[PDB]
């Protein structure tokens, strides 16, 4: 087997074509950016999540 | 042929999952030939 797959038919494991070893693949960290604001009418300091 | 002929259709590893593949397969409980090519029968036998 050249590589691997998961339930959703997406790559989850691959073999180095040169050397025979198994390494799993996961997406690098990503997510949403949420801004915590008390309101422009009240202040301008905010916290980002 | 009761239940044989199942082969890996791709070079992808899967585990703890059921995958449906549409590919040339031997039907389950199919009918396969039974060629012998050496029929040793008779009082002294033969090599048909
Ligand atoms: C730009 C803005 O939000 N201005 C409001 C103003 O209309 C309001 O009267 C006050 C308190 O009542 O707070 C501030
Ligand atoms: C064309 C065809 O079906 N040929 C034979 C059938 O005559 C037989 O009854 C069956 C036995 O399971 O094996 C097959
Ligand atoms: C391919 O080459 C590398 C270095 O040139 C070597 O370490 C590796 O074992 C080779 N792959 C083989 C022999 O399958």
mmCIF file with all atom_site columns, C-alpha atoms and ligand atoms in Angstrom:
data_model
loop_
_atom_site.group_PDB
_atom_site.id
_atom_site.type_symbol
_atom_site.label_atom_id
_atom_site.label_alt_id
_atom_site.label_comp_id
_atom_site.label_asym_id
_atom_site.label_entity_id
_atom_site.label_seq_id
_atom_site.pdbx_PDB_ins_code
_atom_site.Cartn_x
_atom_site.Cartn_y
_atom_site.Cartn_z
_atom_site.occupancy
_atom_site.B_iso_or_equiv
_atom_site.pdbx_formal_charge
_atom_site.auth_seq_id
_atom_site.auth_comp_id
_atom_site.auth_asym_id
_atom_site.auth_atom_id
_atom_site.pdbx_PDB_model_num
ATOM   1   C CA . UNK A 1 1  ? 0.000   0.000   0.000   1.00 0.00 ? 1  UNK A CA 1
ATOM   2   C CA . UNK A 1 2  ? 1.462   3.320   -1.123  1.00 0.00 ? 2  UNK A CA 1
ATOM   3   C CA . UNK A 1 3  ? -0.433  5.564   1.311   1.00 0.00 ? 3  UNK A CA 1
ATOM   4   C CA . UNK A 1 4  ? -3.500  5.640   3.555   1.00 0.00 ? 4  UNK A CA 1
ATOM   5   C CA . UNK A 1 5  ? -6.994  7.074   3.757   1.00 0.00 ? 5  UNK A CA 1
ATOM   6   C CA . UNK A 1 6  ? -9.709  7.792   6.318   1.00 0.00 ? 6  UNK A CA 1
ATOM   7   C CA . UNK A 1 7  ? -13.472 7.315   6.571   1.00 0.00 ? 7  UNK A CA 1
ATOM   8   C CA . UNK A 1 8  ? -14.141 10.400  4.427   1.00 0.00 ? 8  UNK A CA 1
ATOM   9   C CA . UNK A 1 9  ? -11.799 9.257   1.617   1.00 0.00 ? 9  UNK A CA 1
ATOM   10  C CA . UNK A 1 10 ? -9.096  11.777  2.527   1.00 0.00 ? 10 UNK A CA 1
ATOM   11  C CA . UNK A 1 11 ? -5.391  11.066  2.915   1.00 0.00 ? 11 UNK A CA 1
ATOM   12  C CA . UNK A 1 12 ? -4.376  10.233  6.488   1.00 0.00 ? 12 UNK A CA 1
ATOM   13  C CA . UNK A 1 13 ? -1.140  8.226   6.117   1.00 0.00 ? 13 UNK A CA 1
ATOM   14  C CA . UNK A 1 14 ? 1.676   8.163   3.556   1.00 0.00 ? 14 UNK A CA 1
ATOM   15  C CA . UNK A 1 15 ? 4.879   6.196   2.987   1.00 0.00 ? 15 UNK A CA 1
ATOM   16  C CA . UNK A 1 16 ? 8.156   7.805   2.001   1.00 0.00 ? 16 UNK A CA 1
ATOM   17  C CA . UNK A 1 17 ? 8.806   6.554   -1.567  1.00 0.00 ? 17 UNK A CA 1
ATOM   18  C CA . UNK A 1 18 ? 12.542  6.269   -0.815  1.00 0.00 ? 18 UNK A CA 1
ATOM   19  C CA . UNK A 1 19 ? 12.522  4.615   2.629   1.00 0.00 ? 19 UNK A CA 1
ATOM   20  C CA . UNK A 1 20 ? 9.838   2.265   3.964   1.00 0.00 ? 20 UNK A CA 1
ATOM   21  C CA . UNK A 1 21 ? 8.228   4.014   6.924   1.00 0.00 ? 21 UNK A CA 1
ATOM   22  C CA . UNK A 1 22 ? 4.732   5.139   7.912   1.00 0.00 ? 22 UNK A CA 1
ATOM   23  C CA . UNK A 1 23 ? 3.963   8.765   8.778   1.00 0.00 ? 23 UNK A CA 1
ATOM   24  C CA . UNK A 1 24 ? 0.481   10.130  9.439   1.00 0.00 ? 24 UNK A CA 1
ATOM   25  C CA . UNK A 1 25 ? -0.605  13.453  7.945   1.00 0.00 ? 25 UNK A CA 1
ATOM   26  C CA . UNK A 1 26 ? -2.802  16.026  9.676   1.00 0.00 ? 26 UNK A CA 1
ATOM   27  C CA . UNK A 1 27 ? -3.748  19.559  8.607   1.00 0.00 ? 27 UNK A CA 1
ATOM   28  C CA . UNK A 1 28 ? -1.679  22.284  10.206  1.00 0.00 ? 28 UNK A CA 1
ATOM   29  C CA . UNK A 1 29 ? -3.384  24.394  12.848  1.00 0.00 ? 29 UNK A CA 1
ATOM   30  C CA . UNK A 1 30 ? -6.215  26.560  11.543  1.00 0.00 ? 30 UNK A CA 1
ATOM   31  C CA . UNK A 1 31 ? -9.448  28.013  12.833  1.00 0.00 ? 31 UNK A CA 1
ATOM   32  C CA . UNK A 1 32 ? -11.651 31.040  13.145  1.00 0.00 ? 32 UNK A CA 1
ATOM   33  C CA . UNK A 1 33 ? -10.696 34.457  14.484  1.00 0.00 ? 33 UNK A CA 1
ATOM   34  C CA . UNK A 1 34 ? -13.214 35.931  16.928  1.00 0.00 ? 34 UNK A CA 1
ATOM   35  C CA . UNK A 1 35 ? -12.929 39.476  18.283  1.00 0.00 ? 35 UNK A CA 1
ATOM   36  C CA . UNK A 1 36 ? -14.050 40.273  21.829  1.00 0.00 ? 36 UNK A CA 1
ATOM   37  C CA . UNK A 1 37 ? -15.196 43.901  21.854  1.00 0.00 ? 37 UNK A CA 1
ATOM   38  C CA . UNK A 1 38 ? -17.105 45.696  24.647  1.00 0.00 ? 38 UNK A CA 1
ATOM   39  C CA . UNK A 1 39 ? -18.417 48.090  21.985  1.00 0.00 ? 39 UNK A CA 1
ATOM   40  C CA . UNK A 1 40 ? -17.015 51.095  20.144  1.00 0.00 ? 40 UNK A CA 1
ATOM   41  C CA . UNK A 1 41 ? -19.484 53.239  22.098  1.00 0.00 ? 41 UNK A CA 1
ATOM   42  C CA . UNK A 1 42 ? -17.926 51.972  25.359  1.00 0.00 ? 42 UNK A CA 1
ATOM   43  C CA . UNK A 1 43 ? -14.214 51.490  24.587  1.00 0.00 ? 43 UNK A CA 1
ATOM   44  C CA . UNK A 1 44 ? -11.687 50.421  21.954  1.00 0.00 ? 44 UNK A CA 1
ATOM   45  C CA . UNK A 1 45 ? -9.720  47.688  23.749  1.00 0.00 ? 45 UNK A CA 1
ATOM   46  C CA . UNK A 1 46 ? -10.426 44.229  22.322  1.00 0.00 ? 46 UNK A CA 1
ATOM   47  C CA . UNK A 1 47 ? -9.284  40.633  22.753  1.00 0.00 ? 47 UNK A CA 1
ATOM   48  C CA . UNK A 1 48 ? -8.831  38.208  19.850  1.00 0.00 ? 48 UNK A CA 1
ATOM   49  C CA . UNK A 1 49 ? -9.732  34.520  20.157  1.00 0.00 ? 49 UNK A CA 1
ATOM   50  C CA . UNK B 2 1  ? -16.813 -21.036 -5.742  1.00 0.00 ? 1  UNK B CA 1
ATOM   51  C CA . UNK B 2 2  ? -18.415 -20.023 -2.454  1.00 0.00 ? 2  UNK B CA 1
ATOM   52  C CA . UNK B 2 3  ? -16.550 -16.916 -1.244  1.00 0.00 ? 3  UNK B CA 1
ATOM   53  C CA . UNK B 2 4  ? -13.186 -16.174 -2.871  1.00 0.00 ? 4  UNK B CA 1
ATOM   54  C CA . UNK B 2 5  ? -11.596 -13.786 -5.342  1.00 0.00 ? 5  UNK B CA 1
ATOM   55  C CA . UNK B 2 6  ? -11.748 -10.680 -3.145  1.00 0.00 ? 6  UNK B CA 1
ATOM   56  C CA . UNK B 2 7  ? -8.620  -8.587  -3.683  1.00 0.00 ? 7  UNK B CA 1
ATOM   57  C CA . UNK B 2 8  ? -7.400  -5.144  -2.714  1.00 0.00 ? 8  UNK B CA 1
ATOM   58  C CA . UNK B 2 9  ? -8.460  -2.848  -5.598  1.00 0.00 ? 9  UNK B CA 1
ATOM   59  C CA . UNK B 2 10 ? -6.063  -0.019  -4.685  1.00 0.00 ? 10 UNK B CA 1
ATOM   60  C CA . UNK B 2 11 ? -2.827  0.727   -2.832  1.00 0.00 ? 11 UNK B CA 1
ATOM   61  C CA . UNK B 2 12 ? -4.577  2.668   -0.034  1.00 0.00 ? 12 UNK B CA 1
ATOM   62  C CA . UNK B 2 13 ? -4.680  1.525   3.590   1.00 0.00 ? 13 UNK B CA 1
ATOM   63  C CA . UNK B 2 14 ? -7.972  1.655   5.487   1.00 0.00 ? 14 UNK B CA 1
ATOM   64  C CA . UNK B 2 15 ? -8.983  0.310   8.887   1.00 0.00 ? 15 UNK B CA 1
ATOM   65  C CA . UNK B 2 16 ? -12.168 0.054   10.959  1.00 0.00 ? 16 UNK B CA 1
ATOM   66  C CA . UNK B 2 17 ? -14.185 1.257   7.960   1.00 0.00 ? 17 UNK B CA 1
ATOM   67  C CA . UNK B 2 18 ? -16.378 -0.314  5.279   1.00 0.00 ? 18 UNK B CA 1
ATOM   68  C CA . UNK B 2 19 ? -15.626 0.865   1.735   1.00 0.00 ? 19 UNK B CA 1
ATOM   69  C CA . UNK B 2 20 ? -17.752 0.160   -1.344  1.00 0.00 ? 20 UNK B CA 1
ATOM   70  C CA . UNK B 2 21 ? -15.757 -0.465  -4.531  1.00 0.00 ? 21 UNK B CA 1
ATOM   71  C CA . UNK B 2 22 ? -17.109 -0.889  -8.070  1.00 0.00 ? 22 UNK B CA 1
ATOM   72  C CA . UNK B 2 23 ? -14.542 -3.074  -9.826  1.00 0.00 ? 23 UNK B CA 1
ATOM   73  C CA . UNK B 2 24 ? -14.168 -6.370  -11.675 1.00 0.00 ? 24 UNK B CA 1
ATOM   74  C CA . UNK B 2 25 ? -14.866 -9.022  -9.022  1.00 0.00 ? 25 UNK B CA 1
ATOM   75  C CA . UNK B 2 26 ? -15.694 -12.710 -8.918  1.00 0.00 ? 26 UNK B CA 1
ATOM   76  C CA . UNK B 2 27 ? -19.357 -12.977 -7.823  1.00 0.00 ? 27 UNK B CA 1
ATOM   77  C CA . UNK B 2 28 ? -19.922 -14.689 -4.495  1.00 0.00 ? 28 UNK B CA 1
ATOM   78  C CA . UNK B 2 29 ? -21.183 -18.277 -4.733  1.00 0.00 ? 29 UNK B CA 1
ATOM   79  C CA . UNK B 2 30 ? -20.278 -18.237 -8.430  1.00 0.00 ? 30 UNK B CA 1
ATOM   80  C CA . UNK B 2 31 ? -19.637 -21.212 -10.725 1.00 0.00 ? 31 UNK B CA 1
ATOM   81  C CA . UNK B 2 32 ? -16.017 -21.955 -11.654 1.00 0.00 ? 32 UNK B CA 1
ATOM   82  C CA . UNK B 2 33 ? -14.698 -24.718 -13.873 1.00 0.00 ? 33 UNK B CA 1
ATOM   83  C CA . UNK B 2 34 ? -13.092 -27.822 -12.373 1.00 0.00 ? 34 UNK B CA 1
ATOM   84  C CA . UNK B 2 35 ? -10.508 -28.915 -14.930 1.00 0.00 ? 35 UNK B CA 1
ATOM   85  C CA . UNK B 2 36 ? -8.407  -31.868 -13.771 1.00 0.00 ? 36 UNK B CA 1
ATOM   86  C CA . UNK B 2 37 ? -6.062  -32.434 -16.750 1.00 0.00 ? 37 UNK B CA 1
ATOM   87  C CA . UNK B 2 38 ? -4.818  -35.664 -15.128 1.00 0.00 ? 38 UNK B CA 1
ATOM   88  C CA . UNK B 2 39 ? -7.498  -38.375 -14.960 1.00 0.00 ? 39 UNK B CA 1
ATOM   89  C CA . UNK B 2 40 ? -5.954  -41.416 -13.262 1.00 0.00 ? 40 UNK B CA 1
ATOM   90  C CA . UNK B 2 41 ? -8.746  -43.980 -13.571 1.00 0.00 ? 41 UNK B CA 1
ATOM   91  C CA . UNK B 2 42 ? -9.102  -47.641 -14.486 1.00 0.00 ? 42 UNK B CA 1
ATOM   92  C CA . UNK B 2 43 ? -7.557  -50.887 -13.326 1.00 0.00 ? 43 UNK B CA 1
ATOM   93  C CA . UNK B 2 44 ? -4.027  -49.571 -13.960 1.00 0.00 ? 44 UNK B CA 1
ATOM   94  C CA . UNK B 2 45 ? -4.805  -45.865 -14.402 1.00 0.00 ? 45 UNK B CA 1
ATOM   95  C CA . UNK B 2 46 ? -3.954  -43.433 -17.174 1.00 0.00 ? 46 UNK B CA 1
ATOM   96  C CA . UNK B 2 47 ? -2.523  -39.943 -17.718 1.00 0.00 ? 47 UNK B CA 1
ATOM   97  C CA . UNK B 2 48 ? -5.200  -38.183 -19.761 1.00 0.00 ? 48 UNK B CA 1
HETATM 98  C C1 . LIG C 3 .  ? -22.110 57.338  18.955  1.00 0.00 ? 1  LIG C C1 1
HETATM 99  C C2 . LIG C 3 .  ? -22.869 56.846  20.150  1.00 0.00 ? 1  LIG C C2 1
HETATM 100 O O1 . LIG C 3 .  ? -23.070 55.652  20.347  1.00 0.00 ? 1  LIG C O1 1
HETATM 101 N N1 . LIG C 3 .  ? -23.314 57.788  20.988  1.00 0.00 ? 1  LIG C N1 1
HETATM 102 C C3 . LIG C 3 .  ? -24.067 57.486  22.196  1.00 0.00 ? 1  LIG C C3 1
HETATM 103 C C4 . LIG C 3 .  ? -25.147 58.537  22.431  1.00 0.00 ? 1  LIG C C4 1
HETATM 104 O O2 . LIG C 3 .  ? -26.063 58.528  21.342  1.00 0.00 ? 1  LIG C O2 1
HETATM 105 C C5 . LIG C 3 .  ? -25.883 58.255  23.734  1.00 0.00 ? 1  LIG C C5 1
HETATM 106 O O3 . LIG C 3 .  ? -26.787 59.316  24.021  1.00 0.00 ? 1  LIG C O3 1
HETATM 107 C C6 . LIG C 3 .  ? -24.891 58.117  24.885  1.00 0.00 ? 1  LIG C C6 1
HETATM 108 C C7 . LIG C 3 .  ? -25.545 57.701  26.183  1.00 0.00 ? 1  LIG C C7 1
HETATM 109 O O4 . LIG C 3 .  ? -26.957 57.847  26.121  1.00 0.00 ? 1  LIG C O4 1
HETATM 110 O O5 . LIG C 3 .  ? -23.915 57.111  24.574  1.00 0.00 ? 1  LIG C O5 1
HETATM 111 C C8 . LIG C 3 .  ? -23.146 57.398  23.408  1.00 0.00 ? 1  LIG C C8 1
HETATM 112 C C1 . LIG C 3 .  ? -24.456 -21.970 -16.821 1.00 0.00 ? 2  LIG C C1 1
HETATM 113 C C2 . LIG C 3 .  ? -24.545 -22.611 -15.469 1.00 0.00 ? 2  LIG C C2 1
HETATM 114 O O1 . LIG C 3 .  ? -25.179 -22.104 -14.549 1.00 0.00 ? 2  LIG C O1 1
HETATM 115 N N1 . LIG C 3 .  ? -23.893 -23.769 -15.326 1.00 0.00 ? 2  LIG C N1 1
HETATM 116 C C3 . LIG C 3 .  ? -23.875 -24.523 -14.082 1.00 0.00 ? 2  LIG C C3 1
HETATM 117 C C4 . LIG C 3 .  ? -25.290 -24.926 -13.681 1.00 0.00 ? 2  LIG C C4 1
HETATM 118 O O2 . LIG C 3 .  ? -25.840 -25.782 -14.676 1.00 0.00 ? 2  LIG C O2 1
HETATM 119 C C5 . LIG C 3 .  ? -25.279 -25.635 -12.332 1.00 0.00 ? 2  LIG C C5 1
HETATM 120 O O3 . LIG C 3 .  ? -26.612 -25.882 -11.901 1.00 0.00 ? 2  LIG C O3 1
HETATM 121 C C6 . LIG C 3 .  ? -24.564 -24.778 -11.294 1.00 0.00 ? 2  LIG C C6 1
HETATM 122 C C7 . LIG C 3 .  ? -24.415 -25.467 -9.958  1.00 0.00 ? 2  LIG C C7 1
HETATM 123 O O4 . LIG C 3 .  ? -24.437 -24.534 -8.887  1.00 0.00 ? 2  LIG C O4 1
HETATM 124 O O5 . LIG C 3 .  ? -23.240 -24.468 -11.752 1.00 0.00 ? 2  LIG C O5 1
HETATM 125 C C8 . LIG C 3 .  ? -23.216 -23.717 -12.966 1.00 0.00 ? 2  LIG C C8 1
HETATM 126 C C1 . LIG C 3 .  ? 17.124  5.100   -1.806  1.00 0.00 ? 3  LIG C C1 1
HETATM 127 O O1 . LIG C 3 .  ? 18.325  5.865   -1.590  1.00 0.00 ? 3  LIG C O1 1
HETATM 128 C C2 . LIG C 3 .  ? 18.564  6.234   -0.224  1.00 0.00 ? 3  LIG C C2 1
HETATM 129 C C3 . LIG C 3 .  ? 19.811  7.087   -0.216  1.00 0.00 ? 3  LIG C C3 1
HETATM 130 O O2 . LIG C 3 .  ? 20.345  7.239   -1.525  1.00 0.00 ? 3  LIG C O2 1
HETATM 131 C C4 . LIG C 3 .  ? 18.697  4.979   0.630   1.00 0.00 ? 3  LIG C C4 1
HETATM 132 O O3 . LIG C 3 .  ? 18.886  5.351   1.991   1.00 0.00 ? 3  LIG C O3 1
HETATM 133 C C5 . LIG C 3 .  ? 17.441  4.129   0.491   1.00 0.00 ? 3  LIG C C5 1
HETATM 134 O O4 . LIG C 3 .  ? 17.587  2.925   1.234   1.00 0.00 ? 3  LIG C O4 1
HETATM 135 C C6 . LIG C 3 .  ? 17.178  3.805   -0.978  1.00 0.00 ? 3  LIG C C6 1
HETATM 136 N N1 . LIG C 3 .  ? 15.939  3.050   -1.112  1.00 0.00 ? 3  LIG C N1 1
HETATM 137 C C7 . LIG C 3 .  ? 15.850  1.714   -1.205  1.00 0.00 ? 3  LIG C C7 1
HETATM 138 C C8 . LIG C 3 .  ? 17.141  0.946   -1.176  1.00 0.00 ? 3  LIG C C8 1
HETATM 139 O O5 . LIG C 3 .  ? 14.768  1.149   -1.315  1.00 0.00 ? 3  LIG C O5 1
#
